[PDB]
Subunit: 67 residues, 6 copies
Amino acid sequence: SISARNQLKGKVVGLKKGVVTAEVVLEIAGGNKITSIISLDSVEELGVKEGAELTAVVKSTDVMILA
Amino acid sequence: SISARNQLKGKVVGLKKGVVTAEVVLEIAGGNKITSIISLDSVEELGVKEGAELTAVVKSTDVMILA
Amino acid sequence: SISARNQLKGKVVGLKKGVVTAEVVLEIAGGNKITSIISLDSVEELGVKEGAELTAVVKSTDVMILA
Amino acid sequence: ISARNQLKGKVVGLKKGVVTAEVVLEIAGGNKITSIISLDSVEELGVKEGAELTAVVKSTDVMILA
Amino acid sequence: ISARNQLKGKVVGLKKGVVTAEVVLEIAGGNKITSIISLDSVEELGVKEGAELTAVVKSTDVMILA
Amino acid sequence: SISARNQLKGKVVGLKKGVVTAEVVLEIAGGNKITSIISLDSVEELGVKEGAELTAVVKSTDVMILA
Ligand code: MOO
Ligand code: MOO
Ligand code: MOO
Ligand code: MOO
Ligand code: MOO
Ligand code: MOO
Ligand code: MOO
Ligand code: MOO
């Protein structure tokens, strides 16, 4: 119910922990890949792991268009 | 060749022009929908129209994770 | 259950609808005013109105420090 | 500045990485604000625990949860 | 402020919508900067053509093209 | 050919690699310093190095006005 209009359901296939940030790579429907860099705290708090089923969220105003 | 790690190839199915911004809705592979709000200038300059084939770009650091 | 680490509860004191986006000002702890600019579409589906209790959400990576 | 979200608080956490850094400020009512910025900024503004600072956020970066 | 991108320029365009507004500043070397902010900010900072202002951008929002 | 309206040409004067992200400082017209924090992965694939000419890109919606 949050306004972010892009919610892409997917599966974690890559995970890399840094000191402050984290990188979560999801395999989503149709064969596309989504790359997320978020805080390492949210990554540990949400219990993300390779194979977990997750949703990638993106606010519309953060989406560019390439012709 | 730009760093934005999320490039989702798709087809414009919705277009709405505002005064300063624009909303471009793409149908992408696998049946997902992407919603873009960008400037109405880039929308007119790139020549976006319903049915055009476009790529949605999203910088990794703008992607959240929902468990 | 989203990685976005900042989630500030409040009540809607401001609502302005545009053509593509819309403005939502929430009053949070301490009378602090939070202003959110989102899609017109999102406000309508989330049924936002003056007095509604909603939560404002911000990804850490959008949060700057002013000294 | 144009960013309309400016919240005053007290540094209650600071995590320094290699490129970025986390600052956790406690603002009015016990809410905590998490900010990830550049290490460079954390060295230059003078950020440390106990310090009073303001969290700034651009409106268009704020989502709404119903 | 922590945002490390602060470019000084002169307002050469201003477009007012209902909720947001476009400001186009000309900075050093003829480059133009496009910024979409809240109408509210455009009314309060005092933005108009000819005015000198600074464009601010957070590092983590800047992409790189090779 | 991307909607991102700000594209500032420059030469790399700064490069710092982290674990998940990396920092790139470009020198543009007027000696102005632009700092970009992106994914470590992106810097490696784009082969970024001191002295490289690259273009910094920013979406309008991330650009604030300081008075
Ligand atoms: O309606 Mo949104 O929060 O700009 O995707
Ligand atoms: O040094 Mo990081 O890759 O910002 O945790
Ligand atoms: O490497 Mo990026 O520009 O943070 O997606
Ligand atoms: O009033 Mo708009 O929908 O920001 O052009
Ligand atoms: O970058 Mo976060 O971990 O979604 O606040
Ligand atoms: O008017 Mo702002 O810079 O989108 O908060
Ligand atoms: O990410 Mo910064 O250090 O607020 O420009
Ligand atoms: O919001 Mo834009 O039209 O990608 O600069």
